[PDB]
Amino acid sequence: EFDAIKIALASPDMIRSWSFGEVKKPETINYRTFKPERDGLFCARIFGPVKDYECLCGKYKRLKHRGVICEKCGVEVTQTKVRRERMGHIELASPTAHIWFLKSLPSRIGLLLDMPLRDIERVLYFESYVVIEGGMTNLERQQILTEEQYLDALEEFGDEFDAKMGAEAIQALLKSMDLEQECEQLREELNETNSETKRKKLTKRIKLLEAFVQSGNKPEWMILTVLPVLPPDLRPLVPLDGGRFATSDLNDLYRRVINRNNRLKRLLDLAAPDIIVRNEKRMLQEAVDALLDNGRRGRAITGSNKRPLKSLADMIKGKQGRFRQNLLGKRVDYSGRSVITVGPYLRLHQCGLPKKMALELFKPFIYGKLELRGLATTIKAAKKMVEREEAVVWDILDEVIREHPVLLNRAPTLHRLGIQAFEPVLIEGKAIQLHPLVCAAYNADFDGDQMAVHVPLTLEAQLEARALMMSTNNILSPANGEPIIVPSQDVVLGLYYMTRDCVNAKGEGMVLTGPKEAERLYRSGLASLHARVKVRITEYEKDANGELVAKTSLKDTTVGRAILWMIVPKGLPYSIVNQALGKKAISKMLNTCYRILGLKPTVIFADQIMYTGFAYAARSGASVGIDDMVIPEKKHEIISEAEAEVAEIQEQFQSGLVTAGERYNKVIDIWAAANDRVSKAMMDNLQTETVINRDGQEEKQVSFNSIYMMADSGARGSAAQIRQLAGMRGLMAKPDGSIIETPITANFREGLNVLQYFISTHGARKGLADTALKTANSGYLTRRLVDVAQDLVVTEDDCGTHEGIMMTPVIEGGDVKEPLRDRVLGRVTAEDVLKPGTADILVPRNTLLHEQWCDLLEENSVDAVKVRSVVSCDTDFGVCAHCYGRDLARGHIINKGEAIGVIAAQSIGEPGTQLTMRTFHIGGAASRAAAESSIQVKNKGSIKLSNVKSVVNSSGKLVITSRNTELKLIDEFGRTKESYKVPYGAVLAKGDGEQVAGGETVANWDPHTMPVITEVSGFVRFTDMIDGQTITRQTDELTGLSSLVVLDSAERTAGGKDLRPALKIVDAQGNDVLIPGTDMPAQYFLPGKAIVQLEDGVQISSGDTLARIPQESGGTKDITGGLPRVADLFEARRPKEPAILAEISGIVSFGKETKGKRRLVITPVDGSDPYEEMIPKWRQLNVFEGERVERGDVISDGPEAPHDILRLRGVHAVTRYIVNEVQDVYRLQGVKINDKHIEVIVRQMLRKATIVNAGSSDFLEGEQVEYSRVKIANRELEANGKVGATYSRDLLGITKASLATESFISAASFQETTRVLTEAAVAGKRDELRGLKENVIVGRLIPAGTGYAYHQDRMRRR
Template structure:
């Protein structure tokens, strides 16, 4: 590693005037940029070559010295150093200011750092800095006090009374600089600590803020007066370029305009001072200089922004850093890369799982350097130049070389948006004609790709290490599982499912004569021959002799099945556990999958195959399933036409019956027997039931060989809800407020709708489209915040040796009487480590030993045993100070193997929660009509509300005591719910009658139980049940939202986010530590500091854990680089500079920003000394010696 990159941490601080001069290569004195006649930079101007370096490599300004041989010489005529032109990207200049100027970040930021140091309000500070008032620096013999603020009239009066030399009062940054330089930081810090002892309320919080800033200056060693600038640094010219346009005009960076304003005003002020101009004119010029510097640093922060042509605000230095287009997010976190291309994707059904089709032209361009090297190596060309000409001409020899080059060189394919780790996968390229990339159909689900014009990008991994990683970790055939829940992601879809469904369906019994003997065959081959000769069909029952080997013995017998199922089973392993062979005998001959196979069953088959036979074998089986599915969907010839959508005859009758019932309800309403709300609900309910009855009739009517029904039932395309709209009845729609319209749509899409029906339905159709667009942005922003909070959670060690654990049980949803399981105990314990022995409550047998991994089979045994709670190791209780340990995490769901050190589990957690975000609903549901109170937030807004730890909409009342409930209805449209504890303590809650109470008289409630319907404020749970209670609540609630939307997600991902939300402690009393009262400190730092202090016999600090929302927690991270690249860039950098923060570079973002390898995966320190040796003929000796050495070392 080069010297410049060899550092462990990076710091930021305030620059002193001397430091700025040290950076500078010369003073910029003139506002000119370039000479418009010669197009050369002006001397001493903003692009001066003498200061910033030559514009052409190895050439001075006047042309006296040209060529590299004069390297390092400074021209005696023009003063330009002969060097590379790229120094113009790094050499800075400076402007020596005629009057001190304040830095707007430290004056205007929230809180104002200058204001806190001087104990002045930002408003008063502004009056001084912008020459509207005087501040007393030395009161002398007057009755004034230091820091008093006086206006112009008062100043004159004091001058006339006491004389100009008897006291000192100044205005502008000069005055503030004098005051700042007089401050004794150490004495002030001690004084503030003493004041804190007696202070209360608002005064105390103000003192804490002041002390925080003063302590920051004390610890960092920076002088407060450095917040005032005497010397202004000038950015290197290549970072604020000026380019010539076609018409001879120039386009320039806004910074040049802003610098020019500063230089003009500075020069004018210098002239006025030399001329001894009147005070009022000088003051006005100083104020304008202050405003010019403000605009340069942060345009628009104070007053109106300086605008350029077309009234557009100019982009200042702060704007260069901020936002999506700023330096952090545009250039440091995302960079353009060489060796990449993009094209439209088309399906490649004949490809293997690990292959992709790469267009020949694209491949040649991507692998050009490799091809040229091979050509020179095999002496087909003399040098690189002629090799390049050969490649550009093309020809057979070039294509043959390209074939050799790409043989063992994987490429990465990426489809934007990359929502999870499966959005980039590696493939072995296969050269194809045409200009489109061919993609294996089974990886489409992972990429969320389809072939309607989607594009994908190709990247070439260059180094041997990168290629090894691509091959072993990223190859598509190794990525068969979803990181969200560990289920297979490469399940066949659409045509493939339909083909396999067609293959495994059997005939109805009445399709053939039950008396006729079944065709019998001696083995599979004979049956297959009969099928090929059209003697039998795929679907009719046949008898066939089957021979299997069990424990070394050959068993033979006749089974009854269909030809289709025989063909399907011919590619499957026969030990997946679907067939019950426990009784032996004839059962041993059963086919493994002798049942109808749709998409759901295929998923189970693949999951078991991975579990039993591993990924390599499953990849081969998947390819065979793909081929078989396409083949038999073609043979089946299943297609749909309008006549396949058969409308049930009973539909008219059912609708007429419903209309009679509705008329009766309306009559009852008119008589006054029903209120309007009751009438509305009854009408909506009748139509809902009618729609369901028509749907049932439709199912019976279609028959199992109807193509539409087959597609839906197999899971290939469509669902019963869509079929209902095609051939049944569209039913009730929602209006713009989300309320169900009571007039139903009686027609279906096959019959067509009338005008009124069309208008009622059009709102829902449009809303879904606009919802999707909004949802994508919201979901993306949620993912970004989650990534930011969890990006430094990496598996840092094998085992943290903690004895802490959590109790897990099945998660249930619904009211007391209608509870259903949202997540089984099986899903919560599989792939986790047991904290202690898990014992069967009935047999007392140990199901899982403590400290061992719970396998799928063991998890099933635990669930079957009737155990309600299991103690497991968890991310929430991991004792790792940064990241988590492998034991507390459990298995890596993306591989199905125990997690290894270096796994970036935080990023995976964020992606797993964010990726299905677009599938969640956007709306807030009405809980029935208007009368039932507040909306309950669901879907994406609910997940956001939980992770941001916000006060929820429709907040529930929770029990603050444990005890028995009594309910009394008062006459004030309220009821009083009283909880009385066993000790006789009671607590009464007044609840409006419109709010549904979910407890009954005499119920026993525990602390934190819900009394009314709605969501709980996480902060309330935090104060009542503590950190453990709130973590459990967040996990349960987030899981419920995903489950309600049909998304499976493992709770370990949510655990990681919840852990990060509770990492901070708020200090209540600092004791003898250096921690400040009221500040937020990392929990692990808090514990370790206290342990050190206690060991010395001193007073430890006191504090409590706080729950922070994900945005706040991201900004409260120890890494200023990570926080600055997330949000509020200028605020984060201001704070970091004052505190002299040091970034320890533990997370991923910080290392990406500074261009180092990320400290995860193979970039971790423990793996850094591994080198990859390409397995090619020329490395034969090296490889053999390496293998021999490793054998010797054991």
């Protein structure tokens, strides 16, 4: 049919061509016999017949007169549905400016006539004049005249020269302007000029001029001459109860516009006075502006009771417009809605449809079979038969519902597992029974939530539901390869009570002949389920090429584990049930079952596990009483110790040892330590408190306490929630994020005070407000992640590249958070990895390394595998299958034609939403750390210190004066096993390269109060710090000691803003000491809020604290406070104090001094040396006058902006930085996301590439054009002898990278619809319908999955 959607400006001739008439009366239906007026907003003559195939007057009434035009009233008889396809127009008496091209920034009229917006805005609204055709006087072609200046120019220059006001003058300016001459003059001026602001303005105007001249648009088309009207059926008037009519907004705006236009037309014929007609023209302009985009001007007009009526733009933009409400998501037929119940008798591919709901959903399907079987002859007889619900209708429903899967969707469809297909099982009731395994995927409990049923109609839809959306084919999460149909909170309790042992039984010493004997003994009551017997079990193994070889042995097991072994499919080792199964254990069991056996045994195993978990949880009576929450007998002693410590802290604070920002931190730390000690005490009193005889004397065992059972099994609970029941509740967190100063010292087994409950209510209301008020800014994150990566699909199989990112285990402060296996599993490597039998290859180059290859790599203990990444792929408009990796939902390579950019966006975007809607499950607990102060190396090995600038201590030890140092522990072999980030000013008890015993301290420091320790010795002079101006000082006259706190930029005076307080270290003779190895004096700056306990002119040593800086780092550290960071990383926001990197490598030296800010010159050894950098006086420089630097090295210190990294250290460095930062943020909350998704989002952030030089190509000098087009053009030119065009990659945030795409439809439907459509209309863009949102809006198959083959056929067809 069509293949493109073109948007451009509408000429008045084209507007008249659209129109089938001219509306010229402000009269709707006459509030009478419901007929349209003569030439009003509704008209049979203009738009179309009101009734189908009936003339308005009453002369033609049937299809036998089709196509003719009446004579009594002149309305052609046709289908009545042409009232929504035939537009009209309004002939404006005076020209009117389009508000979209005036008040959308930047104003097209503003930078087309080179005038400021204020001047043209005063001209349009008849408040000043503009000089068109100045002539032979002192008036330019764009000068602004007021009324007095206009009168002066009239009295003393009353020649043929004219100066008009209003939209007519602006239209004359636009029509009288030549575009090519102006463009070449601007090119001349741009080539002449040198200032960057003037260059940018001139090239922006040049771009606007080129867009105007290339397209068919004209400048004078932005001033409206004829105003088209919407067809009446798109602005209907629905009659209510009575003689009144509905309150339509578009009709009201049209009536206002028509009233103003008719009044102006009448005044233009009677020769009204000038002021009256000008005021009427201004009113017409305001009415048209209110019709086009209401509210963009000063005051939005309101219809009734002070609410602004929606214009033609308010119903196309926003969340409630034709883009996000009726095109990207619609209401559908064959759909239903009801609450859900469990029905645990089901299977993984089944659900329960109510018997009275499936009859109404599958109603046309019942009609078809009733007509086929002959029980009815027409459709009305079958309709009445179904309405009556006869005995034969239910058999027809059973026949038509047999293998017709339906889609069950829960209301927040966060990830793709929120929609799944089940084969219906008809039930009597009104609730949709849902299988208990998919409740984790749906995140659906059964406390009053409803799910929607959808009926796939076509054969293709049914097969997509059966082969793709089926709940059987959805056993792995698409975010990470972990299974998603995991038994939860009752099956795990059953399998934990079953597979467990106590040291006694009804029969314990007996030895059994198999699992059937164990089940028979348990059922007959001759043996407890927790015996310790010896069963003879025949386990199979497929260690050969798929052959199950039996190996019968006699293992020391329990009765429960032997009974459970009857459901484990053949092929799995027995050492997966011979233990106390929790939730992680059986999740691992299902995962290994899928990875070894396949999909069908895994599904059958999941069903059998659910059945035998429910059965043996019912058979146990695992209740919960009030005596199960055993209070420890030593909690109040820990309370007393902590309250004594807090009293000492208060006495230290009031004396003046610490300020009020450090008392907070230390009291939080001491109470959090006391809370953890109480939790440990109660956990030790709970887990092991089972003294039971071994049939002889007393023995110890893991407890059978119900609270501890369902806490240790992972059923429902944790250390926090269980701790709050029998330990102490702890301390709460406010909605702002601040932690409560005072803790609660009671649990939910004793009471709570009338005041402790009030304190707890702060955290409780924080938890409930956080969800409902801050899941909005996490649903926004996933929406603008989807809209930036929607058009990314797998389009190839292998691009053939040797590039790729480097993967290493992430050890950044503790043990191995993620080993190499978790980071490299299921991703195609990029080069033959070399084992430490070097010069021999371990794996080939293009092998998708699965679990066997991961085991092989871990056997040889590899530490770095260069793996292929999405961001480094060489495909155009998509990715290849090898550069992505594994599907992560199935155990194979990703299929060609799969929408991976939407799976990536959902996977990144809904741990945040889900965990910010679940912040109240811990109540309002602080959940903060204990602010660890020292480094205790647990393992054995040597130490390697990275990027350290340390000096000596007064005791001889080492003190760290570097910001980004890392204490990493290397074992005797040579591999890194432990790593720690040591902070500035931290003392070292040991050094580098020396073997440390396992379990002793190495680095000690204060968690708060970071110091400013020096490196040299001498006297210190209080330079540039005077009382009152830059420091707040208070003196104890008794001691004679001063303690001054330097103010921040807030309370510091404006005059003293250029004063920089600092401490110059000086020797005895007034000479400036030197930093060793350099010639720069030891000048050390002091930032704000810093306290100094030293006096002016006191001898010091090397490496001692001169001043202290409080940290005030207080937060609850949930996923709510902690996910503006992901938004900042994905939007690529520059931090406050960027770390200064080296733009070009070479020798570093300084030139001129104090250009307001310091000057640094980098000179290479061979090439050109034109680079100078303006370094502000704020931060010191880590490089000196005689060092060697490379590009990407840090001249200064601070947070790295993810643009310098891109432009200096390359694409791999910036993508690794973003991946690591987002992964750290998510892993802090326990979230597990594979890095393919973050790499995909980074790749979608990397699509623009600014040209450096045009070369032999057709690109411009500094144009920002898509990187794929640049690569295609350069690869095409390099095929011949021509030279390509050099470029530079750009990093745009997820908002800008989605708003600056080549398709204006996606950008318009995402955000800023007015601003996107204005630019598209001016530039005359032509959409190609290439993405997924575009085809969803249009109404086609997405080029993503099963429609990918069809789209390839269609593309290669033409």
